[PDB]
Amino acid sequence: AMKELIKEHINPALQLHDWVEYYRPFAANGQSANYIPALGKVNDSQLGICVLEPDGTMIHAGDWNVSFTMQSISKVISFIAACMSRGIPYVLDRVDVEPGKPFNPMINAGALTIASILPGESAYEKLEFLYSVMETLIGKRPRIHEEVFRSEWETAHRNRALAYYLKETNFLEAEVEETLEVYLKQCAMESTTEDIALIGLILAHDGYHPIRHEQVIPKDVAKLAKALMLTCGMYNASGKYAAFVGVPAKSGVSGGIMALVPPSAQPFQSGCGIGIYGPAIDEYGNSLTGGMLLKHMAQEWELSIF
Amino acid sequence: AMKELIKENPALQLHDWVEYYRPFAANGQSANYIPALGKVNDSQLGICVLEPDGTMIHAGDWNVSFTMQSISKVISFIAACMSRGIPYVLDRVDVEPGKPFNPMINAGALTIASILPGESAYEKLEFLYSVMETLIGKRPRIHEEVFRSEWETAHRNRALAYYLKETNFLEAEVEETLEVYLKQCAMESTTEDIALIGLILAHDGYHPIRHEQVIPKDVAKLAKALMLTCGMYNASGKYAAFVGVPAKSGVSGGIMALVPPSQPFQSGCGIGIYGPAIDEYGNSLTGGMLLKHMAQEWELSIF
Numbered sequence: 122a123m124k125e126l127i128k129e130h131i132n133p134a135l136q137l138h139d140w141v142e143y144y145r146p147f148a149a150n151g152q153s154a155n156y157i158p159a160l161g162k163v164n165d166s167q168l169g170i171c172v173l174e175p176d177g178t179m180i181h182a183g184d185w186n187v188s189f190t191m192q193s194i195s196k197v198i199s200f201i202a203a204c205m206s207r208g209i210p211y212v213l214d215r216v217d218v219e220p221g222k223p224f225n226p227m228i229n230a231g232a233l234t235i236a237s238i239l240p241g242e243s244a245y246e247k248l249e250f251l252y253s254v255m256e257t258l259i260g261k262r263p264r265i266h267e268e269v270f271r272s273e274w275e276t277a278h279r280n281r282a283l284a285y286y287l288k289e290t291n292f293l294e295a296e297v298e299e300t301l302e303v304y305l306k307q308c309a310m311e312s313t314t315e316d317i318a319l320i321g322l323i324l325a326h327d328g329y330h331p332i333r334h335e336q337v338i339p340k341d342v343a344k345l346a347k348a349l350m351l352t353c354g355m356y357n358a359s360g361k362y363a364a365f366v367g368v369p370a371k372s373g374v375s376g377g378i379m380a381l382v383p384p385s386a387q388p389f390q391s392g393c394g395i396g397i398y399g400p401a402i403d404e405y406g407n408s409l410t411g412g413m414l415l416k417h418m419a420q421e422w423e424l425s426i427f
Numbered sequence: 428a429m430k431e432l433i434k435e436n437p438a439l440q441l442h443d444w445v446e447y448y449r450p451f452a453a454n455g456q457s458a459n460y461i462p463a464l465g466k467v468n469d470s471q472l473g474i475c476v477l478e479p480d481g482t483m484i485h486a487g488d489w490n491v492s493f494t495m496q497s498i499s500k501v502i503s504f505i506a507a508c509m510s511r512g513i514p515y516v517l518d519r520v521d522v523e524p525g526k527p528f529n530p531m532i533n534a535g536a537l538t539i540a541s542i543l544p545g546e547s548a549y550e551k552l553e554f555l556y557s558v559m560e561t562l563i564g565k566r567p568r569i570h571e572e573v574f575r576s577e578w579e580t581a582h583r584n585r586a587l588a589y590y591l592k593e594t595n596f597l598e599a600e601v602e603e604t605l606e607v608y609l610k611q612c613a614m615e616s617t618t619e620d621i622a623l624i625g626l627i628l629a630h631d632g633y634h635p636i637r638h639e640q641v642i643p644k645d646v647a648k649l650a651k652a653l654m655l656t657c658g659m660y661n662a663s664g665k666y667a668a669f670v671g672v673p674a675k676s677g678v679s680g681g682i683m684a685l686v687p688p689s690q691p692f693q694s695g696c697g698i699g700i701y702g703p704a705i706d707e708y709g710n711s712l713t714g715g716m717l718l719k720h721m722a723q724e725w726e727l728s729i730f
């Protein structure tokens with residue numbers, strides 16, 4: 122047997138590989154998002170991860186570089202952008218931070234209220250604001266997956282219902298169609314695990330960009346964002362994540378998870394941003410194999426903030 | 428002026444902040460619905476902070492005895508986990524802020540009471556009190572007066588208890604469960620005892636004064652998660668966002684909080700706070716203001 126593999130010599134990169142390959146098959150127990158027809162095309166068995174450190178060290182494994190739409194992960198960015206624009210007190214008069222009346226920014230109703238209060242006299246201006254914030258974080262203007270956007274646009278009855286409800290009850294500060302457009306467009310913003318790992322790292326460092334060496338989000342906005350990820354980030358599994366993983370985290374229906382670990386007293390003692398992708402989702406709406414990866418890392422590396 | 432005071436540090440800070448925040452107790456009231464509770468001096472405010480080396484700082488009415496009320500929910504939850512194991516507990520109770528309910532709310536807490544080991548209320552409470560002794564180092568005093576005034580007027584809890592019995596979530600009889608739940612609530616504490624239980628949770632169930640593991644670590648983490656997510660009634664999200672420490676309130680005005688190892692208190696700490704005037708959400712008004720102050724000044728957020 123002239124050709125073989127090498128028998129060898131602790132190591133997070135090696136562990137991430139072994140774990141992605143072990144958790145990959147479990148995708149057969151979940152589904153790709155159905156209520157958006159464009160997301161039903163995607164291959165289910167995909168699993169990728171990126172962990173990023175403040176010194177620039179990046180480790181990754183699996184499908185870490187495949188593009189996907191941010192979906193609900195964008196609720197965190199629009200929420201941040203709205204606080205930066207309008208200030209925390211104004212945003213919190215219109216949106217609840219608890220897991221008519223205001224709604225939580227991590228659910229569709231509060232996220233629509235948020236899009237509507239972005240600054241700008243049109244959907245285009247609101248979006249340029251949101252992209253300028255996105256660009257200070259990831260260093261580039263985000264790409265809209267227009268296929269995904271248009272198929273969301275034609276079938277968005279539930280979101281139109283809510284938006285009209287919010288306008289009735291005077292919790293939309295903009296027109297319904299204008300609001301839908303902004304909201305559906307942030308959802309269709311593209312990224313890889315790498316981009317979300319970076320936003321995660323920045324939040325882990327209280328809005329400080331450790332690559333650019335700038336304060337890019339105010340500290341109190343970053344805190345507020347993480348509190349919402351910990352309490353409301355994993356839909357109706359947020360309590361379970363807090364108890365069994367213990368790391369602030371945000372999922373989307375395309376299969377992204379953005380997670381983070383703040384500086385704490387090996388590995389990743391300076392903190393880290395985490396980007397996971399696994400398009401097969403569970404009954405709660407969270408990436409199935411991605412959730413399993415994150416729980417394993419958190420338990421194995423003792424990442425819990427508790 | 429032959430006689431005077433002195434011209435001019437967490438201890439000094441805590442004294443100044445208690446004097447500052449005490450007057451704000453005029454914007455709330457003590458609990459009405461428990462008649463024996465709506466009778467306490469509304470203007471009280473006290474605090475104890477406990478470090479794992481033994482060091483203790485206290486200001487105000489830190490040594491005034493009060494009933495634990497909902498703080499007891501964390502103990503019985505922990506006690507049920509230690510007895511039955513986590514998997515058994517989480518089949519009957521939800522960790523989300525017939526269906527199971529959350530253990531931090533009345534309905535979940537009644538279920539937990541009903542699963543404590545023992546075939547009567549006395550045996551269930553005996554395991555509970557003995558767990559409590561391993562934490563604070565004494566068996567706890569029960570406020571029999573608070574208990575029997577709550578027991579006479581406990582319609583809502585009986586309604587809930589019979590609802591849980593109907594839907595199959597009570598592993599005991601209704602009157603038995605109600606007795607256990609109402610007595611756990613009337614267990615008595617000072618800011619010091621709850622500071623100690625908070626210190627122990629901050630160390631993952633390790634008693635840093637005694638040097639032994641008293642709560643298993645996974646149980647201890649689960650208790651902390653539940654406090655951060657559900658511990659402050661319908662203000663838990665606000666506390667997470669602007670305070671950032673796992674905390675649990677009680678309607679008698681107690682708050683137990685804790686800071687994990689992460690200056691000051693780099694080794695972590697337990698916090699016991701008392702402030703009988705409560706707000707609309709059911710949390711200590713001035714105790715909550717104190718806690719938010721300390722957390723912001725000393726950057727305690729675990730975020």
Ligand SMILES: N=NCC(=O)CC[C@H](N)C(=O)O
Nearest residue numbers: 156192193273276277280374
């Ligand atoms: N995580 N979320 C996406 C949404 O909530 C948008 C709904 C979807 N675009 C639809 O309206 O079909």
Ligand SMILES: N=NCC(=O)CC[C@H](N)C(=O)O
Nearest residue numbers: 461496497577580581584678
């Ligand atoms: N913090 N408390 C919750 C309670 O349910 C207290 C019980 C109350 N004494 C009652 O009247 O049933």
